[PDB]
Amino acid sequence: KISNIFEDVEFCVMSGTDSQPKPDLENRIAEFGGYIVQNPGPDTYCVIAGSENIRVKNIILSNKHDVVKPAWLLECFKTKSFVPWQPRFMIHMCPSTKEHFAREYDCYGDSYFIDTDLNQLKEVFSGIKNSNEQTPEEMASLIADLEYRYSWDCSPLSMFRRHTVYLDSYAVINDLSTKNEGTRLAIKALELRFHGAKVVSCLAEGVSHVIIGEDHSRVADFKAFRRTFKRKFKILKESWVTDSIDKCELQEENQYLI
Amino acid sequence: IHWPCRLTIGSNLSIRIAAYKSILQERVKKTWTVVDAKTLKKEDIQKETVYCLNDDETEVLKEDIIQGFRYGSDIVPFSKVDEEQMKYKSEGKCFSVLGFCKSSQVQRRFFMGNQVLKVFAARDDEAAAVALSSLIHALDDLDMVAIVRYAYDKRANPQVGVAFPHIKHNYECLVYVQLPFMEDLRQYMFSSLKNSKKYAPTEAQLNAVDALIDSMSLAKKDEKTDTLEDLFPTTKIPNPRFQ
Amino acid sequence: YSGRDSLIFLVDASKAMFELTPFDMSIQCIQSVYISKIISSDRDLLAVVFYGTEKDKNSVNFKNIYVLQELDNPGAKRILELDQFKGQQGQKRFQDMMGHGSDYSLSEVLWVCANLFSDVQFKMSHKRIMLFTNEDNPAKASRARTKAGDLRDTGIFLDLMHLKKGFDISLFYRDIISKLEDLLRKVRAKETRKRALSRLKLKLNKDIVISVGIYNLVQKALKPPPIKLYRETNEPVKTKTRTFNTSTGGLLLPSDTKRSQIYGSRQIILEKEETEELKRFDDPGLMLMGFKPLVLLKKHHYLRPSLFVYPEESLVIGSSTLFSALLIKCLEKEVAALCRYTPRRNIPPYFVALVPQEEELDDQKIQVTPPGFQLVFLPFADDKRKMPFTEKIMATPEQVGKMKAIVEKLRFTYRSDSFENPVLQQHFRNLEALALDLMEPEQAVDLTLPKVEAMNKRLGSLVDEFKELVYPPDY
DNA sequence: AATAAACTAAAAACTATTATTATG
DNA sequence: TAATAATAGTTTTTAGTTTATTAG
Say if C192-219+283-380 and C220-282 have the same CATH topology.
no
Give the CA-trace dihedral at A117, A123, A127, A131, to 10 degrees: 80
Measured distance CA(A256)–CA(A188) in Å, rounded: 14
Cα–Cα distance measured from residue B16 to residue B9, given in angstroms and rounded to the nearest whole number: 11
The superfamily in CATH containing domain C220-282 is Ku70, bridge and pillars (4.10.970.10)
Residue–nucleotide distance: C310 CA to D21 C1' (Å): 39
Q: How far apart are CA C54 and CA C63, in angstroms?
A: 8
Greatest CA span in chain C, whole angstroms? 97
List the beta bridge partners of residue C456: none
Exposed (0-12), middle (13-18) or buried (19+): which is B3, by Cβ within 10 Å?
middle
CB B132, CB B174: distance < 8 Å: yes
- Determine phi and psi for B15, rounding to 5 degrees: -130, 125
Using CA atoms, how far residue C470 sits from A159, B20, B121, B207, in Å, is 76, 29, 19, 67
Closest by Cβ to B85, choosing from A38, A39, A58: A58
Collapse the DSSP code of B184 into the 3-class scheme (helix H, G, I; strand E, B; otherwise coil) and give the result. helix
Choose the closest CB to A55 out of C232, C233, C434: C434
Q: Are B98 and B148 in contact (CB under 8 A)?
A: yes
Q: Which residues, 6 or more positions from B117, have their beta carbon under 8 angstroms from its beta carbon?
A: B3, B19, B20, B21, B22, B175, B176
Say which amino acid occupies B28: V
Residue B29 Cβ < 7 Å to strand E: no
Q: Give the neighbor-by-neighbor strand order of the sheet with B74-76.
A: B74-76, B65-71, C227-230
Scanning C139-168 for CB atoms below 8 A from B yields none
* A57/C232 Cβ within 8 A: no
C1'-nearest nucleotide to the CA of C226: D7
Measured CA to CA, the distance from residue A196 to residue A142 in angstroms comes to: 11
Burial class (CB within 10 angstroms; exposed 0-12, middle 13-18, buried 19+) of C55: middle
Q: CA–C1' span, C239 to D16, in Å?
A: 28
Q: How far apart are CA B221 and CA C130, in angstroms?
A: 62
Which helix or strand (DSSP H or E) is residue C76 part of? Answer: helix C76-83
The class that CATH gives domain C192-219+283-380 is: mainly beta
Q: Which of residues 194-233 of B touch C (CB under 8 A)?
A: 194, 196, 198-201, 205-206, 209-210, 213, 216-219, 228, 230, 232
CB nearest to B53's CB, from C230, C371, C376: C230
CB distance A48 to A68 below 8 Å: yes
Instruction: Calculate how close chain B gets to A90, using CA atoms only, in Å.
Output: 23
CB within 8 A of C153, min separation 6: which ones? none
Alpha-carbon distance values, C453 to A21, B144, C253, C405, C457 (Å): 49, 20, 61, 18, 9
- Comparing CB atoms, the residue among C230, C313, C420 nearest residue B183 is C420
Nearest chain C CA: its distance from A37 CA (Å): 5
Under an 8 A CB cutoff, do B111 and C374 touch? no
Resolution in A for the shown PDB structure?
4.3
Question: According to the CATH classification, is domain C381-475 in 2.40.40.20?
Answer: no
Domain covering C4-191 in this structure, CATH number: 3.40.50.410
Q: In sequence order, which residues have a C-beta less than 8 Å from that of residue B126 and are 6 or more positions away?
A: C392, C393, C469
| Domain range list for chain C | 4-191, 192-219+283-380, 220-282, 381-475
Among chain C residues 290-319, those with CB within 7 Å of any atom of strand E:
305, 307
CB contact under 8 A, C439 and A53: yes
Out of B63, B66, B82, closest to residue A58 by CB: B82
Residues 349-388 of chain C with CB under 8 A from chain A are none
Residue C443 near chain A (CB below 8 Å): no
CA C219 to chain CA centroid, nearest Å: 11
Distances (CA, A) of C282 to B241, C277, C285, C286, C287: 12, 11, 9, 10, 10
Please report the sign of the dihedral spanned by the C-alpha atoms of residue C203, residue C207, residue C210, residue C212. Answer: positive
Q: Is the CB of B78 under 7 A from strand D?
A: no
Contacts of A135 (CB under 8 A, 6+ apart): none
Nearest chain B alpha carbon to C440: B86
Touching partners of A (3+ C-beta pairs < 8 Å): B, C
List bases in chain E with any atom under 7 Å of a protein Cβ: 11-18, 20-22
| Residues of chain C contacting A15 with CB distance shorter than 8 Å | 437
Residue C273 CA to residue C262 CA, distance in Å, equals: 18
Any atom of strand D under 7 A from CB of C123?
A: yes
CA-based torsion, C191, C193, C198, C202: positive or negative: positive
Rounded-to-integer distance, Cα A33 and Cα A7, Å: 4
Q: For residue C470, what are the β-bridge partners?
A: none
Q: Which residue of A has its CA nearest to C436?
A: A53
B156 within 8 A of B90, measured Cβ to Cβ: yes
C465 lies within 8 A of chain B by CB: no
